[PDB]
Amino acid sequence: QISVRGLAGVENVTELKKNFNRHLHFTLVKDRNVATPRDYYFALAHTVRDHLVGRWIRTQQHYYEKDPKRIYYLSLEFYMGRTLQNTMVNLALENACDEATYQLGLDMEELEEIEEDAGLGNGGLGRLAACFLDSMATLGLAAYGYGIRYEFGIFNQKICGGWQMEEADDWLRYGNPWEKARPEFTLPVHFYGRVEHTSQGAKWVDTQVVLAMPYDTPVPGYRNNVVNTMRLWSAKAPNDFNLGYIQAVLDRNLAENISRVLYPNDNFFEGKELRLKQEYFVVAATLQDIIRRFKSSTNFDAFPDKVAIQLNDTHPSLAIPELMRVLVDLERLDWDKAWEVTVKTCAYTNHTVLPEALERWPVHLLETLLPRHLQIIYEINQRFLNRVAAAFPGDVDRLRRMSLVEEGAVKRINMAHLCIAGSHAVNGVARIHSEILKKTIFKDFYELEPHKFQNKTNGITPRRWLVLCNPGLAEIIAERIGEEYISDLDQLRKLLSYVDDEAFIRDVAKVKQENKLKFAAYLEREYKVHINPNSLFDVQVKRIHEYKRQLLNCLHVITLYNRIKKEPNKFVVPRTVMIGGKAAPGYHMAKMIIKLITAIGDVVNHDPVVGDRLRVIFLENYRVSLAEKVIPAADLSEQISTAGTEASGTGNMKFMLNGALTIGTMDGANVEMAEEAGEENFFIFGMRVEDVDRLDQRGYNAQEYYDRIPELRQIIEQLSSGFFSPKQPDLFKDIVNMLMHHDRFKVFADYEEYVKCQERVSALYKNPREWTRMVIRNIATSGKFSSDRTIAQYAREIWGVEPSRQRLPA
Amino acid sequence: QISVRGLAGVENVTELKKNFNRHLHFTLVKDRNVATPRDYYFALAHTVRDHLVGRWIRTQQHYYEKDPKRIYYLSLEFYMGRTLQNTMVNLALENACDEATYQLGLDMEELEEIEEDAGLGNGGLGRLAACFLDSMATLGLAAYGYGIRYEFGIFNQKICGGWQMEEADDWLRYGNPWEKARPEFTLPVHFYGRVEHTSQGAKWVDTQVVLAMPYDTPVPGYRNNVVNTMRLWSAKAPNDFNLGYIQAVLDRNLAENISRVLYPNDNFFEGKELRLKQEYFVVAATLQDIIRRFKSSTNFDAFPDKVAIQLNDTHPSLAIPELMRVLVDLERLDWDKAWEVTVKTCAYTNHTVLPEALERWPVHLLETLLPRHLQIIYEINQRFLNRVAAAFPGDVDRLRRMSLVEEGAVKRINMAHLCIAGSHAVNGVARIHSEILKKTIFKDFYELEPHKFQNKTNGITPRRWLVLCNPGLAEIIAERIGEEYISDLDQLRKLLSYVDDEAFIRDVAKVKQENKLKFAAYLEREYKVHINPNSLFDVQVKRIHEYKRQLLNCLHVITLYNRIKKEPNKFVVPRTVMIGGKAAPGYHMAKMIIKLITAIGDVVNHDPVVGDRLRVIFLENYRVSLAEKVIPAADLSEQISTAGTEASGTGNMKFMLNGALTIGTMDGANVEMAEEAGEENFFIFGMRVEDVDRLDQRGYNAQEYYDRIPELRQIIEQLSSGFFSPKQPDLFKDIVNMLMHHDRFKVFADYEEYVKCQERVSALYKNPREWTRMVIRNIATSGKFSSDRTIAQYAREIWGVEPSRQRLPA
Ligand SMILES: CCCc1cc2cn([C@@H]3O[C@H](CO)[C@@H](O)[C@H](O)[C@H]3O)c(=O)nc2o1
Ligand SMILES: CCCc1cc2cn([C@@H]3O[C@H](CO)[C@@H](O)[C@H](O)[C@H]3O)c(=O)nc2o1
């Protein structure tokens, strides 16, 4: 049908058709009179997976012969989403399968809708890990993702009476065709026990043993025949475990609970034991596998030439003491040499500067659960503090600020300080975020070791985030400039010579109109909701957090409503305002924000005076597959975090790539986006980082904005007096109180400038042609934000390996 | 190689070979340089399973069109063992796969050893269920096995310092290729709640919901292209379950624990809630499936013409109140009509008369867990007691003896009384066992309804228990009489005309010698043990229970030892005495017996005076696949339960079929075996049932035997004084005490006659040729004991359906 989707050759189509029937019969044990759409989906998933394996086996074989340096990406989160279409795209099977399934009388798109998301992450950090695996495979790196096979991923979100309800994400109910269990590669992981000192060194004994069983999932590169591996560990009890006989069998669940469920608290730290167990489990099973693969190549001097381990934040920070542990206690290297190897092996990426997000584990926890690792940590700290003492003699305050050990009420290990001490590189995730690390929370460490600190601005994969979700935009691009930009996104710059091209203008706008039509219809079919597709689609989708200021969006929405009520017969650019995102289950404030959003919708969507000029929708269960649908449909992208709080963001990049304009603050990667497109092609408003600092110094008094801004005061009074909650007039007292007395994120300070900049957007929107030319200028400068660029910078500047676009043979 | 194993055609072999490679590559994702024997086993298991599915799909389709009466066999136990070879045998693929795997350079037998047993049962009762499914498929009945997919089967038995240790049977670690998950057919099962009375009848509300998810396993008939289904339910939590968010997810295990583990207590009842939950779960999920299949054919009058449900003992006795419940509460039939339908649908088989084995559930349990079913039971009882009152007016003692409700300390429901009241037929499992039910525990019920009581003597399948495990005996039989006896075991009678045939004599004996050689070598390779294969192989294998009197065997063994020590230089027929079997984990006495057995081995096997004349081995982890190996190798079968206690036995039948002679009491089916072979061809000793009764009347005084039998007294003194336990002289005081003061099974009363009959066996053994002619006379009369005979009697006399040997088309 469309060209970027590949060839439907008659040999290929005929082959797909018969493999499909074979799987239906043999694998599913169904015949065509009993099959449901879910059987058909499985039959196609099995047929497409058959194309991977040849390539999978030979990619692994190729790495055995060439023995290149191996990259290990350790993360507790891989936010994968659906695998079927992505696999078709990367293998160039998409049109062939479309054709093969049409001939069998099936609609492929309807079958794609049946696949569950692999929701093994919370948001930005887990999705970054997914884009990275894709980019790594596309660039030919010998790279392995390592994580945990959670049995339940991020919860499904249901809204009842406008409140979030959580329900278990049972993503494996029907099976996962993509994974291959490898119980033959099971490995023991130890917990508890005690430390014994022999003549022959320290020994860790009387441990409980949990088994780690790996499942491998293939990661196909883009059309290069590379298939890398994502290995996820599952927890299993050993067989002599506890060994009521009955009760003993039933208590095997205590061990297996380690991999049962993903923790849904993203931007707040909770020091729960089960969480620490998950962190150690993935780090211990992974390092053993790494060391085993290395030994099939005594001399650990070569280890850092053959291994890079990247830590995705501090979740796997225990890789550092664990690698020391294995090198010192089991392989008998001396301390200093083991340390050299560790530092040269490990690298650490930080993803936030929010104080309450940072991991700080109570010492009494580590002491009970990992008593050897605590000893190793104390020894690391001591040697580290002696380098500090020797470079800044007499600076006793530096010593306590830099310690890995925090003193106080309860002593804590600062996991971030551990990663910096034990890694040869530390990077932030956007230029401004990396500068902030150097000037604020890691200032001391940077003064000690300036050479460790780097920036690697985030990116997203253009395979999923353009080709897969937005085939019509990919197609009109490919008409003018060819297909090569899919693996070289810098080529989109060539689109700048089409900015005054009348045909391209009409085509970019036609694709947007189509995506909006399609999405309007998805709203009606699957959630009974009536939207005007001629309205500007104003979208804010991301996890619910105070720093992300969905509340500021709320205020703008209420202002627009109050302006319509004031002058009903005046023309306004109509909008559909959509906000979506999950709240962490114990984050009371986040839950209240969701409730306000739906309460505003209850009022606004039913005012006959408003008409179809303003709609407010809460998008339920935002997740990767919902992102693939709403992002192509958006006109306006809301990225409106308080300057200094969003480390990077990556949603912002999805929307720039798919033809929405951006309203936001100079935060995170928004700064680099504007700088690439030009400040004129972006809607920038609000305090910069410097202005926030000036405001903290003097004190933030919210009362001042409330006294000086009549439109703000009216909204506050409405909130307080029960305008949006007629039956519980005081429903929202916590929000108003927070806004008035302890808003760490200064919602009111950005309010005026935000409302004003929002009028500039409505004005541009009234002139379709100039709106579209600005779109074109965004899409055309979006190339820097490809995760291929990102990964090639990690490869060259941290891992010491060269990317490669060369095909392996088919 | 051998003819009963089928053709190795060149088309077939070439086809198997390539399907094998396809599975290795595509299914296992391995290549030949990485594969382990376990990968090869899987590749063959997948290749053979592909031959089933065509036949599976069309057998199910055939039942849809013909709509025959359906049999539902409900059991909590299916003791399946390995599936690979059985499947090859029944499909006639055995020689073809042998050939295909040899050409790939593999040894098929070595691959067969890798398959885990499906140990979803404890012993006789669970294995009967397995033989029955096989016979049902072979006789073309539209029959379904329904049970529970336990995640852990019967425990693996390890002996340490001569004690049983139990360890978890994790039979699914590596996957089960035979099963197909059917999550699309998941069904809700309810627990707890309360009963509400409306105008429109009773309603069961506020229940907890557990989901039952079915897994289907194919059951191939012998060479008839019939493939029936075994459906086993697994427990799953619903998704809004409990719905710490975290704790809520982790508590999903409480619901799923229902199918976690098989209860290993066979011949003792424990009233634990988890057990009652397992019983209700399988009965509720199964009846819904049954009713659903029936409705795709309002008029429940036809239900009993379209459905038979067989209850394998009282484990699924709740089918009765549950069927009432659905008919009365949900379909709104009136009581009397629902009762008629229930009675005509259900049939009950009893498998024991041991009082402590019978299920008697506390009313406070049923009241909490199943409060509607208790109401239904009270109503059943009342109506039942009114028929009793009216037929035996004034017999108030009959009324309390027959009540379903036992009065006392705690009130209990007698589940056996419920099955008899709610079933149109009640059968025992051997002729003498069925007579005992009529004369003793069910005398009252028989006087009320003589027409319900039947006998169906047990049988074993000659596919697994001859062809599969003893190919060399099957072959020499097939040379003389052809192959037809495999599905018509009565044809073995034709072997009587070979009893004086010199060649047949030498061949029967050659096969026995070969099986012994092979088994001697299995002992050495897999458990470092040195046996003389020229000794008589004296075997007792079965669960460890006092009634089965492994202790009497112990006494004979010690007597033989003491006789050798007394006259060392006298000739004795050498024996290898092997005893094996698991003990229920809380059955202290059973555990002590195992310990005595190994302690006797420690003394006897190391006495240089004994030489290789007497060995005592304990066979560890006896289970179905160990039975397939030791039974062909046996010369002497020990079936020595106290008369009246072994309802039938089925091991006895395995050994008769495979050429061992039998020493035993006139118990269970031993009586019918002797009667079929002739009493002269069997070693019968000991009290009959009548003699045991005469002894209870007068009182059993064990002291009397101890005073009158010098050889017995010596053994007792050795036991007491620490001869067999030098380091704990009083280790065995419980055993001696039990033997002396409270032996419910009268070990000493049978001792003299047992030792004497054992000398008659040694004497026959000294004359090889006459030993063998007696073997031939056993094997030749073993036909009655085929489970095909058994099932054809259930079909004709209980289910109302005709068996059929006709092929379905290929
Ligand atoms: C102790 C670890 C805690 C943690 C940090 C953090 C950061 N990010 C996001 O990681 C994304 C990937 O770098 C960034 O684009 C976003 O700005 C950032 O908020 C995220 O999604 N969740 C993570 O939780
Ligand atoms: C409440 C249910 C309890 C139960 C009865 C019982 C009987 N049998 C065996 O069932 C076998 C199958 O009928 C018979 O050959 C054996 O004699 C008999 O002991 C068995 O293996 N286990 C069962 O436990």
Side-chain angles (χ1 to χ4, degrees), chain A residues 218-234:
Chain A
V219 184
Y222 187 69
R223 265 99 125 160
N224 59 177
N225 302 323
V226 160
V227 184
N228 285 338
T229 293
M230 175 176 71
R231 173 164 281 179
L232 298 179
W233 301 102
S234 199

PDB file of all heavy atoms in Angstrom, chain A residues 218-234:
ATOM      1  N   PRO A 218      14.069 -11.083  21.793  1.00  0.00           N
ATOM      2  CA  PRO A 218      14.901 -10.525  20.688  1.00  0.00           C
ATOM      3  C   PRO A 218      14.715  -9.012  20.479  1.00  0.00           C
ATOM      4  O   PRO A 218      13.604  -8.512  20.589  1.00  0.00           O
ATOM      5  CB  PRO A 218      14.393 -11.266  19.448  1.00  0.00           C
ATOM      6  CG  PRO A 218      13.014 -11.732  19.774  1.00  0.00           C
ATOM      7  CD  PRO A 218      13.018 -11.995  21.304  1.00  0.00           C
ATOM      8  N   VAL A 219      15.785  -8.310  20.142  1.00  0.00           N
ATOM      9  CA  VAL A 219      15.726  -6.882  19.810  1.00  0.00           C
ATOM     10  C   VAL A 219      16.293  -6.644  18.422  1.00  0.00           C
ATOM     11  O   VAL A 219      17.535  -6.573  18.265  1.00  0.00           O
ATOM     12  CB  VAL A 219      16.569  -6.065  20.823  1.00  0.00           C
ATOM     13  CG1 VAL A 219      16.452  -4.558  20.546  1.00  0.00           C
ATOM     14  CG2 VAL A 219      16.077  -6.428  22.308  1.00  0.00           C
ATOM     15  N   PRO A 220      15.412  -6.538  17.409  1.00  0.00           N
ATOM     16  CA  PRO A 220      15.878  -6.415  16.028  1.00  0.00           C
ATOM     17  C   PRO A 220      16.405  -5.002  15.659  1.00  0.00           C
ATOM     18  O   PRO A 220      15.751  -3.999  15.946  1.00  0.00           O
ATOM     19  CB  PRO A 220      14.617  -6.733  15.193  1.00  0.00           C
ATOM     20  CG  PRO A 220      13.461  -6.374  16.020  1.00  0.00           C
ATOM     21  CD  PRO A 220      13.924  -6.547  17.506  1.00  0.00           C
ATOM     22  N   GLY A 221      17.569  -4.908  15.030  1.00  0.00           N
ATOM     23  CA  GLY A 221      17.952  -3.593  14.512  1.00  0.00           C
ATOM     24  C   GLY A 221      17.145  -3.190  13.260  1.00  0.00           C
ATOM     25  O   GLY A 221      16.486  -4.032  12.688  1.00  0.00           O
ATOM     26  N   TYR A 222      17.177  -1.924  12.842  1.00  0.00           N
ATOM     27  CA  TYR A 222      16.467  -1.508  11.616  1.00  0.00           C
ATOM     28  C   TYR A 222      17.108  -2.008  10.286  1.00  0.00           C
ATOM     29  O   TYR A 222      18.185  -1.531   9.840  1.00  0.00           O
ATOM     30  CB  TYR A 222      16.307  -0.024  11.579  1.00  0.00           C
ATOM     31  CG  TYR A 222      15.455   0.431  10.448  1.00  0.00           C
ATOM     32  CD1 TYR A 222      14.073   0.168  10.427  1.00  0.00           C
ATOM     33  CD2 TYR A 222      16.036   1.144   9.368  1.00  0.00           C
ATOM     34  CE1 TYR A 222      13.243   0.594   9.298  1.00  0.00           C
ATOM     35  CE2 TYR A 222      15.267   1.565   8.267  1.00  0.00           C
ATOM     36  CZ  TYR A 222      13.883   1.302   8.237  1.00  0.00           C
ATOM     37  OH  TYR A 222      13.198   1.755   7.154  1.00  0.00           O
ATOM     38  N   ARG A 223      16.458  -3.011   9.692  1.00  0.00           N
ATOM     39  CA  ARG A 223      16.865  -3.518   8.383  1.00  0.00           C
ATOM     40  C   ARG A 223      18.372  -3.862   8.295  1.00  0.00           C
ATOM     41  O   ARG A 223      18.966  -3.768   7.246  1.00  0.00           O
ATOM     42  CB  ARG A 223      16.470  -2.480   7.351  1.00  0.00           C
ATOM     43  CG  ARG A 223      15.127  -2.823   6.780  1.00  0.00           C
ATOM     44  CD  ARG A 223      13.900  -2.105   7.332  1.00  0.00           C
ATOM     45  NE  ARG A 223      13.252  -1.514   6.163  1.00  0.00           N
ATOM     46  CZ  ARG A 223      11.986  -1.107   6.037  1.00  0.00           C
ATOM     47  NH1 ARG A 223      11.076  -1.198   7.004  1.00  0.00           N
ATOM     48  NH2 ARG A 223      11.641  -0.569   4.885  1.00  0.00           N
ATOM     49  N   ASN A 224      19.030  -4.160   9.397  1.00  0.00           N
ATOM     50  CA  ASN A 224      20.426  -4.550   9.254  1.00  0.00           C
ATOM     51  C   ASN A 224      20.724  -6.017   9.573  1.00  0.00           C
ATOM     52  O   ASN A 224      21.919  -6.452   9.645  1.00  0.00           O
ATOM     53  CB  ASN A 224      21.335  -3.632  10.085  1.00  0.00           C
ATOM     54  CG  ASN A 224      20.990  -3.639  11.570  1.00  0.00           C
ATOM     55  OD1 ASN A 224      21.687  -2.993  12.352  1.00  0.00           O
ATOM     56  ND2 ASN A 224      19.972  -4.391  11.972  1.00  0.00           N
ATOM     57  N   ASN A 225      19.652  -6.774   9.785  1.00  0.00           N
ATOM     58  CA  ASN A 225      19.763  -8.155  10.226  1.00  0.00           C
ATOM     59  C   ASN A 225      20.470  -8.346  11.553  1.00  0.00           C
ATOM     60  O   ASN A 225      20.892  -9.438  11.862  1.00  0.00           O
ATOM     61  CB  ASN A 225      20.405  -9.040   9.125  1.00  0.00           C
ATOM     62  CG  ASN A 225      19.625  -8.988   7.850  1.00  0.00           C
ATOM     63  OD1 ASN A 225      18.388  -8.935   7.872  1.00  0.00           O
ATOM     64  ND2 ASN A 225      20.327  -8.949   6.733  1.00  0.00           N
ATOM     65  N   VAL A 226      20.581  -7.318  12.373  1.00  0.00           N
ATOM     66  CA  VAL A 226      21.153  -7.535  13.702  1.00  0.00           C
ATOM     67  C   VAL A 226      19.969  -7.826  14.637  1.00  0.00           C
ATOM     68  O   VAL A 226      18.918  -7.210  14.534  1.00  0.00           O
ATOM     69  CB  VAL A 226      22.024  -6.338  14.137  1.00  0.00           C
ATOM     70  CG1 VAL A 226      22.221  -6.291  15.687  1.00  0.00           C
ATOM     71  CG2 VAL A 226      23.348  -6.321  13.383  1.00  0.00           C
ATOM     72  N   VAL A 227      20.119  -8.829  15.499  1.00  0.00           N
ATOM     73  CA  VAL A 227      19.149  -9.122  16.529  1.00  0.00           C
ATOM     74  C   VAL A 227      19.915  -9.281  17.862  1.00  0.00           C
ATOM     75  O   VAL A 227      20.636 -10.278  18.087  1.00  0.00           O
ATOM     76  CB  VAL A 227      18.247 -10.318  16.227  1.00  0.00           C
ATOM     77  CG1 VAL A 227      17.169 -10.483  17.366  1.00  0.00           C
ATOM     78  CG2 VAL A 227      17.563 -10.186  14.828  1.00  0.00           C
ATOM     79  N   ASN A 228      19.749  -8.274  18.737  1.00  0.00           N
ATOM     80  CA  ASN A 228      20.347  -8.307  20.049  1.00  0.00           C
ATOM     81  C   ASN A 228      19.371  -8.935  21.043  1.00  0.00           C
ATOM     82  O   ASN A 228      18.255  -9.333  20.691  1.00  0.00           O
ATOM     83  CB  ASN A 228      20.777  -6.913  20.492  1.00  0.00           C
ATOM     84  CG  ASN A 228      22.042  -6.449  19.768  1.00  0.00           C
ATOM     85  OD1 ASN A 228      22.803  -7.264  19.279  1.00  0.00           O
ATOM     86  ND2 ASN A 228      22.282  -5.144  19.742  1.00  0.00           N
ATOM     87  N   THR A 229      19.832  -9.061  22.270  1.00  0.00           N
ATOM     88  CA  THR A 229      19.094  -9.780  23.309  1.00  0.00           C
ATOM     89  C   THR A 229      18.754  -8.892  24.459  1.00  0.00           C
ATOM     90  O   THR A 229      19.613  -8.131  24.924  1.00  0.00           O
ATOM     91  CB  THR A 229      19.955 -10.903  23.871  1.00  0.00           C
ATOM     92  OG1 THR A 229      20.139 -11.853  22.827  1.00  0.00           O
ATOM     93  CG2 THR A 229      19.260 -11.591  25.027  1.00  0.00           C
ATOM     94  N   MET A 230      17.518  -8.983  24.916  1.00  0.00           N
ATOM     95  CA  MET A 230      17.114  -8.414  26.218  1.00  0.00           C
ATOM     96  C   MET A 230      16.884  -9.576  27.169  1.00  0.00           C
ATOM     97  O   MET A 230      16.007 -10.387  26.921  1.00  0.00           O
ATOM     98  CB  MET A 230      15.834  -7.578  26.128  1.00  0.00           C
ATOM     99  CG  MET A 230      15.304  -7.074  27.510  1.00  0.00           C
ATOM    100  SD  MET A 230      13.866  -5.995  27.454  1.00  0.00           S
ATOM    101  CE  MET A 230      12.552  -7.128  26.986  1.00  0.00           C
ATOM    102  N   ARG A 231      17.664  -9.652  28.254  1.00  0.00           N
ATOM    103  CA  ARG A 231      17.575 -10.782  29.204  1.00  0.00           C
ATOM    104  C   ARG A 231      16.959 -10.293  30.543  1.00  0.00           C
ATOM    105  O   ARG A 231      17.457  -9.361  31.188  1.00  0.00           O
ATOM    106  CB  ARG A 231      18.943 -11.416  29.418  1.00  0.00           C
ATOM    107  CG  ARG A 231      18.919 -12.453  30.507  1.00  0.00           C
ATOM    108  CD  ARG A 231      20.131 -13.343  30.482  1.00  0.00           C
ATOM    109  NE  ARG A 231      19.959 -14.341  29.443  1.00  0.00           N
ATOM    110  CZ  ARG A 231      20.836 -15.283  29.117  1.00  0.00           C
ATOM    111  NH1 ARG A 231      21.979 -15.376  29.775  1.00  0.00           N
ATOM    112  NH2 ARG A 231      20.541 -16.156  28.129  1.00  0.00           N
ATOM    113  N   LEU A 232      15.837 -10.895  30.922  1.00  0.00           N
ATOM    114  CA  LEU A 232      15.098 -10.453  32.083  1.00  0.00           C
ATOM    115  C   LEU A 232      15.022 -11.653  33.054  1.00  0.00           C
ATOM    116  O   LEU A 232      14.658 -12.740  32.649  1.00  0.00           O
ATOM    117  CB  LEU A 232      13.688 -10.001  31.676  1.00  0.00           C
ATOM    118  CG  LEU A 232      13.488  -8.822  30.723  1.00  0.00           C
ATOM    119  CD1 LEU A 232      11.958  -8.545  30.424  1.00  0.00           C
ATOM    120  CD2 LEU A 232      14.154  -7.616  31.338  1.00  0.00           C
ATOM    121  N   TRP A 233      15.375 -11.441  34.314  1.00  0.00           N
ATOM    122  CA  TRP A 233      15.455 -12.521  35.285  1.00  0.00           C
ATOM    123  C   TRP A 233      14.130 -12.625  36.017  1.00  0.00           C
ATOM    124  O   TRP A 233      13.491 -11.618  36.301  1.00  0.00           O
ATOM    125  CB  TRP A 233      16.518 -12.188  36.318  1.00  0.00           C
ATOM    126  CG  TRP A 233      17.832 -11.995  35.742  1.00  0.00           C
ATOM    127  CD1 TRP A 233      18.435 -10.833  35.518  1.00  0.00           C
ATOM    128  CD2 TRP A 233      18.749 -13.025  35.363  1.00  0.00           C
ATOM    129  NE1 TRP A 233      19.699 -11.040  35.000  1.00  0.00           N
ATOM    130  CE2 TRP A 233      19.916 -12.385  34.895  1.00  0.00           C
ATOM    131  CE3 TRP A 233      18.706 -14.436  35.402  1.00  0.00           C
ATOM    132  CZ2 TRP A 233      21.040 -13.094  34.418  1.00  0.00           C
ATOM    133  CZ3 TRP A 233      19.835 -15.168  34.881  1.00  0.00           C
ATOM    134  CH2 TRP A 233      20.970 -14.483  34.407  1.00  0.00           C
ATOM    135  N   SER A 234      13.749 -13.863  36.304  1.00  0.00           N
ATOM    136  CA  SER A 234      12.599 -14.219  37.110  1.00  0.00           C
ATOM    137  C   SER A 234      13.111 -14.986  38.349  1.00  0.00           C
ATOM    138  O   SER A 234      14.041 -15.777  38.248  1.00  0.00           O
ATOM    139  CB  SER A 234      11.750 -15.200  36.299  1.00  0.00           C
ATOM    140  OG  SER A 234      10.428 -15.268  36.798  1.00  0.00           O
TER     141      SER A 234
END
